[PDB]
Curated annotation (Swiss-Prot), chains A, B, D:
The keyword Iron does not apply. This is Nucleoprotein. It comes from Human respiratory syncytial virus A (strain A2). GO terms for biological process: symbiont-mediated suppression of host cytoplasmic pattern recognition receptor signaling pathway via inhibition of MAVS activity; symbiont-mediated suppression of host cytoplasmic pattern recognition receptor signaling pathway via inhibition of MDA-5 activity; symbiont-mediated suppression of host NF-kappaB cascade; symbiont-mediated suppression of host PKR/eIFalpha signaling; symbiont-mediated suppression of host type I interferon-mediated signaling pathway. GO terms for molecular function: protein serine/threonine kinase inhibitor activity; RNA binding. The gene is N. It holds the Pfam family Pneumo_ncap. Belongs to the paramyxoviruses nucleocapsid family. Keywords: Capsid protein, Helical capsid protein, Host cytoplasm, Host-virus interaction, Inhibition of host innate immune response by virus, Inhibition of host interferon signaling pathway by virus, Inhibition of host MAVS by virus, Inhibition of host MDA5 by virus, Inhibition of host NF-kappa-B by virus, Inhibition of host PKR by virus, Inhibition of host RLR pathway by virus, Interferon antiviral system evasion, Phosphoprotein, Ribonucleoprotein, RNA-binding, Viral immunoevasion, Viral nucleoprotein, Virion.
RNA sequence: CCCCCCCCCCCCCCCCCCCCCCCCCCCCCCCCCCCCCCCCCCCCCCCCCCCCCCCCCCCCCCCCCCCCCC
């Protein structure tokens, strides 16, 4: 029977990758600092001092946000995440200590952290800039409120909201989503961009881009922190904003699956073409694979999971071209920089999707009605 | 088959969030006072003294109501709630002690509580104001009744009724439901607003708004206290009022689901439009998700649960516009400040819902009858 | 009632012109006119309601 | 039942027009010459003399061709045709006689016809021109053949072939098909355009246009002559050419019916639009009417039959626009000067018909396959 | 009002048939017994009963139709 001349390549590749009986273990290189719940207050203080500092220097904001996320997770869970990701990690204990230095010819008390990645001078200078900006702004408006201070419990979570936007745009492969990050961080968080002098979305976004590029394990740590944070029973409104912006990253890098479901929903006719119907077997194969994967598959492209390539639909040029055409016809493709590889099917689907709005729907009374 | 080109994104996101294998643990900052059953009588006395004090100062009423709720729960359950919500809490023991001070040049006996959040001066001044207001009102009417006193066992529960109204309106994101809280606290509790001189709904509502804004964990504590209180076998009539007002908050922030069920019930025709039928698959997805969640989902938006965004229907502009139009046509939309994002479907549904009252119903004898 | 519905449908489709006959059920006339107008922006209405 | 709210206007109009119990009888004005079989040879001689005359004057060729057709029919059938068409006719007997005149100072014998419409001078001058052209061409090539002479039995039938082309293009309402007539008379009849010096398609076509414009009863006579000629058991090859060119006129003025059948055959999707399906009832009404009419309906527009307007499809703007779009997309519309009255449906159908050639066909596996 | 475009057709190859073959052939008359049929008893019917009985005229309002475009 010709019906059994078939090969389930996607499922077989998945079974090969999921049934490996040997494991690799990478070496991060530089030692990882693992803060615990103890220093969460101090890291939040540092984030607040960065936020209240106008004309601020955000060169180190990405690392400080990563430290805050790791302190929220805790040392045990951070270590367990790093092992489960397949890393050899030098767990570095983080504890708070005092440092005494004379600036302006006056003895001064600073409370800093033992971070191998972040030197004492940097934290001291962050405090100095924050203090003098606070002095100037207190002079210019008289009395402060808990709104204008580093002691707010959500100062770190605003920075992590910026990180969540960066994560949403990470799947583009470079810093091309920086403009989108800035635009969305101006739409969202506009009250904060009033309230905090140093909340500069572009600088923080660039810092997080840099830290994610240099340390790929921080992407894994941040994704699992975001999943753990989104699994809480509740929280403040800033944590709700972070959860909403983080789940905006679910399915990033897999827009074609959603647009294919959309093209099925609007019932585009060019799904009835000969070549599309030729590829439909493996297309349904891919969709069933995505469903069997389920929730974990939504962050494959952000995490650079090796099995991300199994979810691709560009390996079916005709179906992909029809899907892109339908997306462009419905007016939702935007600046999507993926290009069709069957221009004719793309144009036909685009035209039909455009007439799907002036000419509402097409019946199929043809053929017996 | 084109029927298997589908993705269950809502369910996959829920499974991802519910199957997390790492947890975060937040730090509240300031220490939490955890009163036990021992001081419930004294906290109720404090609430009664606040209530019988005319022209009262309600700056601290929200914290005192929170303390009363936590004393009703007990220290064990309050601590367990705070852990289950994912908080690091400094459990502060609350016990009663005496303080002696000379006011009016006379030695005076006061019995106060060891609360870190509430200083002794504040409790002393509350007692002073209550005592002199009691003296003045006793002078002006001769003899008091158990109706006019702080020893009533429901004085704290009236304050918690005001808190329940504030909770009902918390999902609006700000203090825009203050007018509704005042109106409902005048409709309900009018006998009390006679009986108690200091029962000022606006001041207590503002105090509870402030305490819920500053301490997001108090929202969790109060919601679980309200659930535990509503699980009792019975109580007084004020506790019944509190239970009725608290379950008025169930489903807050999710009005569109109820209005969609309503639009299905009145059988609005614009549910048969092309785009609405395109979105119906994911709409049924969302409704099945809400049902699988069940009872716990009714307080997701009040608690700022991260999975609250999964219940949204505004991600389907056409269905949402039809639902808003049907609600506006039936005359129940009120001042709902959500706006349609398909004006045409909104207007069509509104018009049909309006003719659903003069022109009772429409048969579908068209097509074969 | 039927005449009013018919006039409303004619006016909604934009073909009634200066037809000087007038409806004697204004409500049905207006309802039919409105539905006929939405029959052009909102192409057709399915009846998936009731078992589909 | 709403299914019986229907009116069969086309069929009712046809029954009204076909069941009239009173008849009109028009008056042609000028007397009609009715030649019989006797003078067929002489009229064919006259046509041959016109054909062999180079640089000829074809002012009277249309009338001579009409006389030849009427002589082929016979006087009885010509009279019966004129009565059945509803005309009052002065039947004029045509017989041959001799006329003697002196040209070049020499007595000369001419044999002419008693035609009221055609004077003796005209026939004499036709003979003179033919004779001297024959003399010149005999001088220039030495000896003639039966190919180069007026005695050929098909000289009149070539002129009637030109008349048949003019009839094919008569439905355009004016002399706009003159270029098409000339082009087709050059493609066909090229051997004759060699063989006959005076076979000028444009002059003969203009003469036939003039005679058909002045005498509308000659259109009826010629159409019924062409039907009678095409009902013969056989004939020469020129008569076969005439029959082929005459049946090319069948269905002239009714191209939209054929193009609608074509759009049904290629299964254009825009036949499933809402408005097209609204009009399909009366469209099928018109097609059933055309079939009930049958063969006689193919010459309604040429004859200006009053019931020609009942076969129109432009009374259904959406279906007509779809049909024109399908015709233009398939590349067969040419210079058809009818214009769509729904531009959107026209463009949509044109686009789909164009993709019907690169994208062969579209399956309807959508909806359950 | 309607209509409006393009378009002659044809074109090759090809007689068919061809063999063998008379059919039949035997045996065989059919029938054969026994047997008339019927047979009893029995007229049928039988009573009671005329039918009907009331109430009730009917009706009553409003309303020309049409109107466009082609």
């Amino acid at each position: 029977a010709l019906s059994k001349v078939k090969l389930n390549d996607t499922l077989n590749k998945d079974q090969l990758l999921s049934s490996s009986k040997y494991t690799i273990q990478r070496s991060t290189g530089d030692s990882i600092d693992t803060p615990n719940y103890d220093v969460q207050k101090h890291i939040n203080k540092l984030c607040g001092m960065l936020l209240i500092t106008e004309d601020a220097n955000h060169k180190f904001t990405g690392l400080i946000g990563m430290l805050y996320a790791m302190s929220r997770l805790g040392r045990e869970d951070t270590i367990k995440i790093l092992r489960d990701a397949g890393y050899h990690v030098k767990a570095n204990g983080v504890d708070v200590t005092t440092h005494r230095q004379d600036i302006n010819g006056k003895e001064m008390k600073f409370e800093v952290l033992t971070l191998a990645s972040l030197t004492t001078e940097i934290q001291i200078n962050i405090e100095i800039e924050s203090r003098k900006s606070y002095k100037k702004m207190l002079k210019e408006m008289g009395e402060v409120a808990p709104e204008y201070r580093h002691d707010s419990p959500d100062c770190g979570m605003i920075i992590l909201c910026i990180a969540a936007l960066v994560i949403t745009k990470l799947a583009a492969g470079d810093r091309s989503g920086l403009t989108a990050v800035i635009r969305r961080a101006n739409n969202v968080l506009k009250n904060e961009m009033k309230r905090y002098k140093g909340l500069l979305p572009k600088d923080i976004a660039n810092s997080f881009y840099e830290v994610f590029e240099k340390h790929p394990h921080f992407i894994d740590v941040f994704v699992h922190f975001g999943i753990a944070q989104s699994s809480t029973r509740g929280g403040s409104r800033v944590e709700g904003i972070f959860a909403g912006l983080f789940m905006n990253a679910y399915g990033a890098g897999q827009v074609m699956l959603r647009w294919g479901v959309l093209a099925k929903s609007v019932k585009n006719i060019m799904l009835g073409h000969a070549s599309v119907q030729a590829e439909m077997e493996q297309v349904v194969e891919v969709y069933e694979y995505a469903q069997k994967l389920g929730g974990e598959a939504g962050f494959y492209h952000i995490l650079n999971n090796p099995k991300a390539s199994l979810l691709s639909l560009t390996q079916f040029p005709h179906f992909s071209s029809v899907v892109l055409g339908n997306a462009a016809g419905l007016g939702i493709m935007g600046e999507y920089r993926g290009t069709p590889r069957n221009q004719d099917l793309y144009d036909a689907a685009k035209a039909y999707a455009e007439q799907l709005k002036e000419n509402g729907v097409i019946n199929y009374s043809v053929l017996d009605l």
